[PDB]
């Protein structure tokens, strides 16, 4: 998987798809909307989980989403439910909105709570091993990250 | 202790678990406000919110409201109503619940708290998980009492 | 099941849930709506059956529903399809709108037709026995009630 | 004999039954009026209403319309179209149908009445149930004839 | 099946329902709409396939559909997915809009593409035999028809 | 060679086929324009259109858009994205693609073209079906290149 370099709105998640650890690319695109209510298109992910993430970004991090068309896409055609994808969704969207990309060597694991906190998920060890195997060198996960704001200060400030 | 978070002693399938119910409320930019529900039955959350607005006088009509069951699971369990009601109230009013409190109960349209399956298993799991204080249909009859006792 | 005393909008139905006779509490709440179209939330019941009942109340009994938010709820988490629940739905809602409760010793059985009539249902005997067993002393059912208007004159005038 | 009620000789699964189709119509408070259907296929009711408005000139565009299959069953049976059409017409125009009349037929977009499965079983069940007069694809070709013969 | 004579909006399709060749009547009714957006009711057919056909009629053949209520109905209660029904849907609707009927001896087979072309379908031979058996004498199908416009010039000009 | 038509080398289930993807675009009469999709996943078409508008500057916001998978099949296959993107572009801009060209590729939100399952089977089927020229993830990286090479 050889992907777009330095385009904002891209974030790698160390996911569990079914029973298998996979590193996947979460993509997001944000744009000033013409319509009265902003478009919210989600493909390959749980739209509801995404809404929660979008709400946290807007309310807890002050991202100006309410007039922004937001598209979120899991590259590669899979459909994945994993709560561990939240972090990557949160950061892809943030990256897409402020227009600066994430490092290419970073992989992301975590549940996102309505308070903006990052929460433990199943299979952290497997997820991390697979990220190592796939060649990543920096990791944000619930072991080393507690609040979403910290990850933003660290990579998207 | 950020406001808008409440611990329910749930039955998920056959299994008793302490789960975190979360809510966020803020002024809506829109004609009709957003209701988003994750991990919980949307119609039950809808009933609870109507009780909160109409029986308790919580001004939800111009608020965006988001309710989230933390942990990944999707649980339909009437027993979660109490946590949902309290999480929302807390969130709206900016005052948090104690960290050592766990909640169980169905919530009716009159604002009353109703018996649910598996009370003893729920309570045991709360004890085991380290909670010190409990609100359940055995010691609570109405939402109002819970709000008075904890949300000042 | 020890329930709210003298709150309007509460009505006991002698239902068939699957194959079993159960006495259940139908609850309704009515409120002056802020929105242009009034909310209609139904939980644990057939929304369509409810609509028919709401239409009969408005058109045949003159209940001023069109600007009223109406919530109807089957207490106890079950989801029940029984047509025999119509009567209780009709009376809960009526009670909730006019703001006077039903007697606590009354149990209700019947289908509601679009003309406002009350119609026979399956398992009347079982339903009634269970109501007796559960301690009720007064019964409206298709054996003793033909029109919805009669039940209203009798308990909610 | 209140208007807006018609008896269909239906096939529900394999079984012939005489069922009551009911309709209610009244002036709508709204920009677009309510269509509520219970116990019947909503798209078939939709087609029938379009025939009633466009072929027969019934002024349904500003009417609330409710159609109800009495008895609890959900039946999809093209054979019910005739009763539905007549129940609605009756309701709109405030004139009832005789009590001894039973109806069978599919209704096309031209307003015609079309053959259906199981005519003889349907008719036998009508006889047995005590009905005296019948409208079916064997003796009726168009909705208009039915309306002229019974809804004056 | 003895059907309405010379009413516009009627078109016979030689369909495959499941595995069986059947001649079926596609009916359409078009009317000047009161609402802002025009009604689109489809019964017994694939609504999406119909939309494509309606789009072709409007965009490629200049039918003034945008303010027209359109109802399309497969007579006889079946629900059929066959792409071979497109032609008949296209011509029923056209017939209903311009208010002139199709000949009663004509049967129709074909897929309709977004360019207005008519495309091959499965089971042409079976379809045609059944049309012959049912007593039709003229046939439009992909063997003898390439563009939708040709069929219109031939029967609905 | 009418504009708005593109040939994809698809995997439908296990099977490689050359299929025609079609699009039509025209000025919308409405506040918000129509999106109709047939035979393809609507969310994937939605993503592709957003890439076309936001990355490539195609003015889709006031256009009605219809996308059709010719042939009857319903195929979900990320490999179809390229044909969909090109069919739409072509349609909007009134310039057609050569008749001998076949296309394969997933399209990301950055406008890039991504690897898909079964490339060799897809290409073999294209050869066999008589196509002379191919665009696939082995020789194309971005949508822009495809647009420059063929849609002038």
Name every chain C residue with its beta carbon within 8 A of the beta carbon of D22: 113-115
Pairwise CA distance, residues D101 & F62, whole Å: 56
Residues written for chain A: 157
Rounded to whole angstroms, the maximal C-alpha distance in chain B is 46
Which of D41, D108, D113, D144 to mutate to probe the E interface, most E CBs <10 Å?
A: D108
Look at residues E75, E100, E97 and name the one whose alpha carbon lies nearest to residue E13.
E75
Q: Cβ contact (<8 Å) for B50 and C71?
A: yes
Written as one string, the DSSP assignment of C77-112 is: S-----GGGHHHHHHHHHHHHHT-PPPTTEEE--EE
Pairwise CA distance, residues D23 & D67, whole Å: 4
Chain E residue closest in CA terms to D78 = E77
User: Which residues make beta-bridge pairs with E74?
Assistant: E26
Pairwise CA distance, residues C138 & C155, whole Å: 11
CB–CB of A95/A70 below 8 Å? no
3-class SS at A104?
coil
Other residues' Cβ atoms within 10 Å of the Cβ of residue B105? 29
Q: Cβ contact (<8 Å) for C77 and B108?
A: no
Pairwise CA distance, residues B112 & B142, whole Å: 4
Pairwise CA distance, residues C83 & E82, whole Å: 38
- Is residue F128 classed exposed, middle or buried when 0-12, 13-18 and 19+ CB atoms within 10 A define those classes? exposed
> Taking an 8 Å Cβ-Cβ cutoff, which residues of chain B contact chain A?
2, 4-5, 20, 22-24, 26, 29-30, 34, 36-38, 64, 66, 68, 70-72
Pairwise CA distance, residues F61 & F32, whole Å: 8
Q: What is the DSSP letter of C44?
A: S
Cβ-proximal residues to A79 (8 Å cutoff; 6+ apart), any chain = A44, A45
Name every chain A residue with its beta carbon within 8 A of the beta carbon of F48: none
Identify the helix (H) or strand (E) that includes residue C16.
strand C10-17
Pairwise CA distance, residues C32 & C39, whole Å: 10
CB–CB of F50/F35 below 8 Å? no
Span between the terminal Cα atoms of chain C, in Å: 28
- Is residue F141 classed exposed, middle or buried when 0-12, 13-18 and 19+ CB atoms within 10 A define those classes? middle
Pairwise CA distance, residues F144 & F151, whole Å: 10
Q: What is the DSSP letter of A27?
A: E
CB–CB of D62/D29 below 8 Å? no
Written as one string, the DSSP assignment of D8-61 is: EEEEETTEEEEEEEEEEEEE-SSSS--EEEESB-HHHHHHHHHHHHHTT----T
Residues written for chain B: 152
Pairwise CA distance, residues E156 & E99, whole Å: 9
> Taking an 8 Å Cβ-Cβ cutoff, which residues of chain B contact chain C?
32, 43-44, 46-47, 50-51, 54, 61, 76-78, 106, 108-112, 114-116
Nearest to F108 among A4, A42, A69 (CB): A4
Tokens 């609100």 found at: B135
- Resolution in A, one decimal? 2.7
Which tokens hold the place of E83?
């792409």
Pairwise CA distance, residues C35 & B53, whole Å: 15
Other residues' Cβ atoms within 10 Å of the Cβ of residue E106? 19
3-class SS at C72?
strand
From the CA of E5, how many Å to the nearest CA of chain F? 32
3-class SS at C29?
strand
Which tokens hold the place of D124?
């036998």
Strands (E), E87-137: 106-108, 111-112, 118-119
Q: What is the DSSP letter of A84?
A: G
Tokens 């047995």 found at: D128
- Is residue C157 classed exposed, middle or buried when 0-12, 13-18 and 19+ CB atoms within 10 A define those classes? exposed
Chain E residue closest in CA terms to F42 = E48
Other residues' Cβ atoms within 10 Å of the Cβ of residue F130? 10
Rounded to whole angstroms, the maximal C-alpha distance in chain D is 46
Q: What is the DSSP letter of A83?
A: G
Q: What is the DSSP letter of F31?
A: S
CB–CB of C52/D38 below 8 Å? yes
Q: Compute, in degrees rounded to 10, the torsion defined by CA atoms E3, D50, D21, C154.
A: -170
CA dihedral sign, ordered A106, A112, A114, A117: negative
Tokens 């679009």 found at: C114
> Taking an 8 Å Cβ-Cβ cutoff, which residues of chain F contact chain A?
32, 43-44, 46-47, 50-51, 54, 61, 76-78, 106, 108-112, 114-116
Q: Cβ contact (<8 Å) for A76 and F46?
A: no
- Is residue C150 classed exposed, middle or buried when 0-12, 13-18 and 19+ CB atoms within 10 A define those classes? middle
| Three-state helix/strand/coil letters over D71-115 | CCCCECCHHHHHHHHHHHHHHHHCCCCCCCEEECCEECCCCEEEC
| Helices A148-155 & A86-98 angle (0-180, nearest 10) | 40
Chains touching F (3+ CB pairs < 8 Å): A, E
Cβ-proximal residues to D112 (8 Å cutoff; 6+ apart), any chain = D141, D142, D143, E3, E4
CB–CB of A26/A92 below 8 Å? yes
In chain C, how many domains are there? 1
Q: What is the DSSP letter of C12?
A: E
Chains touching D (3+ CB pairs < 8 Å): C, E
Nearest to B115 among C1, C10, C43 (CB): C1
Which tokens hold the place of D119?
């005519």
Other residues' Cβ atoms within 10 Å of the Cβ of residue E151? 22
Q: What is the DSSP letter of E83?
A: G
Q: Cβ contact (<8 Å) for A7 and F110?
A: yes
Cβ-proximal residues to D7 (8 Å cutoff; 6+ apart), any chain = D18, D19, D20, D21, D83, D101, D102, D103, D131
3-class SS at F2?
coil
Pairwise CA distance, residues C112 & C84, whole Å: 8
Tokens 């009716």 found at: B108
Q: Cβ contact (<8 Å) for D36 and C52?
A: yes
Pairwise CA distance, residues D79 & D48, whole Å: 12
User: Which residues make beta-bridge pairs with A17?
Assistant: A20
Pairwise CA distance, residues E131 & E104, whole Å: 12
Chains touching E (3+ CB pairs < 8 Å): D, F
CB–CB of B122/B16 below 8 Å? yes
From the CA of A6, how many Å to the nearest CA of chain F? 10
Span between the terminal Cα atoms of chain E, in Å: 28
Pairwise CA distance, residues D103 & D131, whole Å: 10
CB–CB of A119/B69 below 8 Å? no
Pairwise CA distance, residues D2 & D7, whole Å: 13
Which tokens hold the place of A16?
């569990």
Pairwise CA distance, residues E106 & B140, whole Å: 76
Pairwise CA distance, residues D109 & D106, whole Å: 10
- Is residue C62 classed exposed, middle or buried when 0-12, 13-18 and 19+ CB atoms within 10 A define those classes? exposed
Q: Cβ contact (<8 Å) for D22 and C121?
A: no
Q: Do chains A and F touch (3 or more CB pairs under 8 A)?
A: yes
Cβ-proximal residues to B62 (8 Å cutoff; 6+ apart), any chain = B27, B28, B33
Other residues' Cβ atoms within 10 Å of the Cβ of residue A61? 14
- Is residue E33 classed exposed, middle or buried when 0-12, 13-18 and 19+ CB atoms within 10 A define those classes? middle
Which tokens hold the place of C132?
């007796």
CB–CB of E39/E70 below 8 Å? yes
- Is residue D30 classed exposed, middle or buried when 0-12, 13-18 and 19+ CB atoms within 10 A define those classes? exposed
- Is residue D25 classed exposed, middle or buried when 0-12, 13-18 and 19+ CB atoms within 10 A define those classes? buried
CB–CB of E87/E118 below 8 Å? yes
CB–CB of D50/D103 below 8 Å? no
Query: Pairing between strand A106-108 and A10-17?
Result: parallel
Other residues' Cβ atoms within 10 Å of the Cβ of residue D121? 14
Query: Pairing between strand A68-74 and A40-43?
Result: parallel
User: Which residues make beta-bridge pairs with F114?
Assistant: F106
Q: Cβ contact (<8 Å) for C9 and B109?
A: yes
Q: Cβ contact (<8 Å) for F4 and E51?
A: no
Q: Do chains C and D touch (3 or more CB pairs under 8 A)?
A: yes
Q: Cβ contact (<8 Å) for D61 and E34?
A: yes
Pairwise CA distance, residues F33 & B110, whole Å: 45
Q: Do chains C and B touch (3 or more CB pairs under 8 A)?
A: yes
Chain D residue closest in CA terms to C48 = D38
Look at residues A46, A33, A61, A18 and name the one whose alpha carbon lies nearest to residue A111.
A46
Which tokens hold the place of B78?
């009437």
Pairwise CA distance, residues D2 & E18, whole Å: 44
Q: Residue B33, CB half-sphere, CA atoms under 13 Å: how many? A: 18
Name every chain D residue with its beta carbon within 8 A of the beta carbon of C56: 24
Tokens 């709401």 found at: C54
Query: Pairing between strand C138-140 and C106-108?
Result: parallel
Domain of residue E118: give its range: 1-157
Name every chain F residue with its beta carbon within 8 A of the beta carbon of E83: 71-72
Buried b (16+ CB within 10 A) or exposed e, F33-72: beebbbbbbebbbbbbbbbbbbbeebebeebbbbbbbbbb
Which of A76, A78, A89, A104 to mutate to probe the F interface, most F CBs <10 Å?
A: A76
CB–CB of E90/E148 below 8 Å? yes
Chains touching A (3+ CB pairs < 8 Å): B, F
Query: Pairing between strand E138-140 and F35-38?
Result: unpaired
User: Which residues make beta-bridge pairs with F75?
Assistant: F40
| Three-state helix/strand/coil letters over chain B | CCCCEEEEEEEECCEEEEEEEEEEEEECCCCCCCEEEECECHHHHHHHHHHHHHCCCCCCCCEEEEEEECCCCCECCHHHHHHHHHHHHHHHHCCCCCCCEEECCEECCCCEEECCCCHHHHHHHHHHCCCCEEECCCCCCEHHHHHHHHCC
Buried b (16+ CB within 10 A) or exposed e, A131-145: beeeebeebbbbeeb
Distances (CA, A) of C133 to A21, C25, C102, C143, F65: 57, 16, 20, 19, 64
From the CA of B137, how many Å to the nearest CA of chain A? 27
From the CA of F46, how many Å to the nearest CA of chain E? 16
CB–CB of D8/D118 below 8 Å? no
Pairwise CA distance, residues D23 & D80, whole Å: 13
From the CA of E6, how many Å to the nearest CA of chain F? 31
Name every chain B residue with its beta carbon within 8 A of the beta carbon of A15: none
From the CA of A64, how many Å to the nearest CA of chain B? 12
Distances (CA, A) of D45 to C47, C67, D122: 18, 27, 21
Chain A residue closest in CA terms to B72 = A83
Which of B80, B109, B112, B140 to mutate to probe the C interface, most C CBs <10 Å?
A: B109
Q: Cβ contact (<8 Å) for B109 and C41?
A: no
Q: Compute, in degrees rounded to 10, the torsion defined by CA atoms C107, C112, C117, C119.
A: -70
Chain D residue closest in CA terms to C60 = D24
CB–CB of C12/C107 below 8 Å? yes
Q: Cβ contact (<8 Å) for D47 and E71?
A: yes
Pairwise CA distance, residues D68 & D24, whole Å: 9
Q: What are phi and psi of A29, to 5 degrees?
A: -140, 135
Residues written for chain D: 152
Q: Cβ contact (<8 Å) for A51 and B38?
A: yes
Pairwise CA distance, residues A61 & A55, whole Å: 9
Pairwise CA distance, residues D13 & D11, whole Å: 6
Q: In what order do the strands lie in the sheet with E40-43?
A: E40-43, E68-74, E20-32, E10-17, E106-108, E138-140
Cβ-proximal residues to C45 (8 Å cutoff; 6+ apart), any chain = C26, C72, C74, C79, C80, C85, C89
Chain D residue closest in CA terms to E74 = D108
């Amino acid at each position: 998987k050889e992907r777009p370099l330095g385009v904002p709105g891209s974030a790698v998640a160390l996911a569990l798809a079914g029973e298998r650890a996979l590193a996947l690319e979460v993509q997001a695109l944000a744009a000033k909307t013409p319509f009265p209510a902003p478009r919210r298109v989600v493909q390959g992910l749980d739209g509801r989980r995404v809404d929660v993430v979008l709400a946290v970004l807007e309310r807890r991090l002050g991202l100006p989403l309410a007039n922004l068309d937001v598209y979120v896409n899991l590259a590669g055609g899979l459909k994945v439910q994993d709560p561990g994808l939240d972090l990557a969704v949160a950061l892809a969207v943030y990256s897409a909105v402020v227009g600066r990309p994430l490092p290419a060597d970073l992989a992301l694991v975590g549940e996102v709570g309505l308070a903006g906190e990052v929460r433990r998920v199943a299979g952290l060890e497997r997820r991390l091993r697979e990220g190592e195997r796939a060649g990543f060198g920096r990791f944000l996960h619930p072991g080393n990250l507690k609040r979403l704001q910290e990850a933003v200060e660290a990579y998207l400030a």
